[PDB]
Symmetry: D2
Subunit: 256 residues, 4 copies
């Protein structure tokens, strides 16, 4: 059998999620707790449950400006069902729009497991001019308030552990070595928290997708119900710079 | 400005969701409550919050068999990032795999607002041989346990209202008119509950997408981490029936 | 066997397309001729071959302004492989960006097969205020030059037939009944030509997709190789109009 | 202006592709020639034109078995428009289903430009156990007939050059060093030909997408017109192996 899975099975037409009867989860687990279960394979603790609710809310939407929203709404504008627009948004979560969560989780997890000093790890990255994933922001040069909020919650709950500490120690050390502070950004913060929960770095973008899809749904629904179809189109004379060949004739012999 | 929105804005680089500071929502609202807010535009009541958690959990996954899971995992098998596989799954939520939520919400809402008798509404549909959306199941002929669970919760919470009543009254009336019971299925149940919350029928598939994306993430992650790339391919001799032209030669003059 | 097909089969690991050995088609049929074969199931005539080359070239690209190009390039900007950006473009070919080909083919084919007068058909549509598919243009009020080019070729080749005639007769009749000319647009022209070839109206968008994908590839490649990742993002203060709730505080009791 | 392009522009509402009036290309260039133009930026020679027709035909379809066809048809089965199914197919062209064209073009181009001996290049790859892109096949151990057909055409046309020679010299050298022949497969053959044309290796998947989309259209159209919606679903008891947790009860305190 080529179709193998350990996620879900049906016993007597009833759905079981990671071994639990779905009908027993309905009304008893929150959606974030059920998400933790389906992804991890086991029920979350109370502290994990609260952190998962906070991580997912943290990324629920970022407005109309990101390429995901532009893509989702442009596909909707072409005259498509809501699922099709949302899917187009999800496609935009590439290396520059979600991949940093995977990269930062790998860096934080490998950093903690290496048992090498934060000084040595940061020196090695800064020396080879390789970007440290999950650090830096165009505007925030003191701290990323989204990271601070998540870390404050992690500390109040006594969830904050070795991965959170490592991620913050690295920001402080980058500042020390560069003489210029580089913040632990929200991608690095979510990566630290998901790592603290024991999730594989290869699942990093999953948290972002699950959290942001409600925002995409809102954007696509708004485009479909408040805008005329085909309204998302550029005005070539106003919005576009042409950089190509000026007009030219085909060779005469090719004209029929 | 062609890019208009009432969903989110940034004030001093901080994100505001439907007017609320996102950093104040983080740690204070559950993910399902934040979903209600972003979609509806206002905070949910306590009863709405509980029903939204239950609806979303109800659809979190349905195993590897649906075309969404097949598509998501086949795209992942082609050697793609997790977002790309999940998006392919979302594309599969078409008229036969999610559209019934839109249709059932329109039927339930129009049914309630018409103030026509349930007998008359059902007689008109059965007479014109048009399928009644949100009713019937291949296996469940007494009741859909997923609907029963959701409706039991709605009744315990005193959330059950005119839309839930209408949806159940229609199932009973179909049974009365056909002499054969046709259940209110889980699509009809979610449609009734979302209608009870005052959501537009055009948002119906949104609830399904938001709820099921965690399952798609789990399936795509499992395919990427437990299976060899390109393992999702058919065996033509074993799995395929060819119904086309038998082999034939091109005309000789076309062979160079 | 649930996987049935009459398109392609393998005999001794060799691919056969609609019964012809693919290796015999390579070097002997043009790409447009092979497209006709795979879609229709039989080889094209010389006139069909020339018309298919012309239809496909007619739609090869329309610049960066359409929502398909915007979506494709925005997905590429998110940091994605070329296939992922192209696919996002294809998603945008909805009811307002390709669906008119399906609609116009159905209208032209049903119009020709009804044997009702063009006067009566147009009167019935204009009376019920239903848009006639494949007619009208924002700028072209005399003739669509893209339609004229295709129809001139169809006439020179003696391909122009009952479907082409019907489509042009309808434009003339709309003008006669409205006292204002409404052109047969390029969607209607391609629909007429594909109908003249005997293709099903349900394949209409297929011609557009096949023809335009080279343009999408060009756009995505250009975005990936000439622009910095994440460059396709709006500037909220400059490009966006916010129409939602002004900022508001959460209820105090919800703040922890 | 953030939307820059050198591909297409409009002058007086008329489309210009790489500086040529689109209406002059229609009826005068074949579709494969127009594809070459839009991708390369200049008109093809007669030999390039013939090779482009042959490359594109070579990949037009591969039947229902690949994950692209499975994904496209499964999305169509969910009840979606033809563009949506085709797009899902295109998403499946990942690292294991199209990426080898990019890799093989880079290898062939870098191999030719290095001016290092084929012996040295192959020894370095075989020593580090890195797969050589564009070589090997599960069944063909003497030669890939699809490569032979393309190379025979390239030789008859006097198109065969330094890139084609390098690609074939590498297959012969792998055989010499391993004592077991590894064929130049069709991905390597197309990569060699596209490299001979001077295309960038980053465009490799583009040729595959453009060539295969007609096959995807055929598959999606066939699924939509010959199969019942939702027919593409697995039978869990027959097709799936469950490898997860056996059923288990939730903790009693969580049951309300
Ligand atoms: C957001 C971003 C573009 C802003 O960078 P910026 O405006 O150049 O940063 P600053 O002005 O504060 O300057 C920081 C300095 O450290 C460098 N730097 C920036 N981010 C860095 C990082 N994450 N790791 C190491 N060095 C970094 C900059 O080049 C600059 O160097 P300088 O000494 O030559 O001046 C950038 O930091 C970034 O890409 N962050 C995310 C990193 C990431 O996650 N990437 C990998 C996954 S995609
Ligand atoms: C799941 C489904 C395929 C199973 O149908 P089934 O196995 O034929 O149903 P049953 O064997 O219990 O028989 C029910 C009878 O009512 C009909 N019927 C089934 N679902 C019906 C519905 N929702 N409304 C009205 N009539 C329906 C059947 O044709 C059958 O008629 P009969 O008197 O000729 O025997 C079907 O009920 C269905 O499609 N349900 C969803 C409906 C929906 O939401 N569609 C619209 C949005 S896609
Ligand atoms: C491109 C388009 C938006 C431009 O329309 P426009 O600028 O309003 O057209 P005009 O100014 O030339 O006026 C044409 C008149 O006929 C109407 N009209 C426009 N297109 C029409 C059509 N295809 N069929 C019937 N009536 C049409 C207009 O409403 C207007 O009516 P009026 O008597 O009240 O003034 C429009 O014609 C269109 O949508 N064309 C494509 C139609 C199509 O294929 N739709 C169905 C598939 S999506
Ligand atoms: C199709 C494929 C799976 C079949 O491989 P196979 O059945 O193992 O091959 P064979 O049985 O003929 O044996 C060839 C030998 O060379 C190795 N080999 C296979 N393909 C190779 C390649 N392209 N380069 C180098 N070594 C290769 C095999 O491991 C085997 O080694 P052995 O000495 O230990 O027996 C494989 O060759 C392949 O993946 N080809 C495509 C390569 C490619 O393009 N990859 C990079 C982009 S994804």
């Amino acid at each position: 059998r080529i179709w193998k899975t350990g996620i879900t099975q049906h016993i007597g037409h009833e759905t079981y999620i990671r071994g639990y009867r779905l009908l027993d989860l309905v009304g008893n687990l929150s959606f974030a707790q059920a998400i933790y279960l389906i992804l991890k394979g086991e029920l979350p603790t109370e502290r994990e449950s609260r952190m998962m609710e906070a991580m997912l809310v943290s990324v629920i939407d970022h407005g109309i400006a990101p390429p995901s929203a532009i893509a989702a709404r442009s596909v909707a504008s072409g005259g498509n069902s809501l699922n099709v627009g949302v899917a187009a948004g999800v496609l935009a979560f590439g290396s520059a729009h979600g991949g940093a969560l995977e990269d930062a989780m790998r860096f934080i997890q490998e950093g903690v497991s290496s048992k090498r000093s934060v000084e040595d790890i940061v020196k090695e990255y800064l020396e080879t001019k390789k970007p440290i994933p999950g650090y830096g922001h165009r505007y925030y040069k003191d701290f990323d308030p989204r990271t601070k909020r998540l870390m404050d919650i992690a500390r109040v709950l006594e969830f904050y552990g070795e991965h959170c500490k490592f991620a913050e120690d690295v920001a402080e050390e980058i500042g020390r070595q560069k003489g210029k502070k580089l913040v632990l950004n929200v991608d690095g913060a979510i990566a630290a928290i998901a790592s603290e929960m024991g999730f594989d770095w290869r699942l990093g973008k999953g948290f972002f997708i699950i959290g942001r899809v409600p925002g995409l749904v809102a954007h696509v629904y708004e485009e479909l119900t408040t805008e005329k179809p085909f309204s998302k189109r550029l005005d070539e004379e106003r919005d576009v710079e042409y950089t190509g060949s000026p007009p030219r004739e085909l060779p005469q012999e090719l004209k029929k």
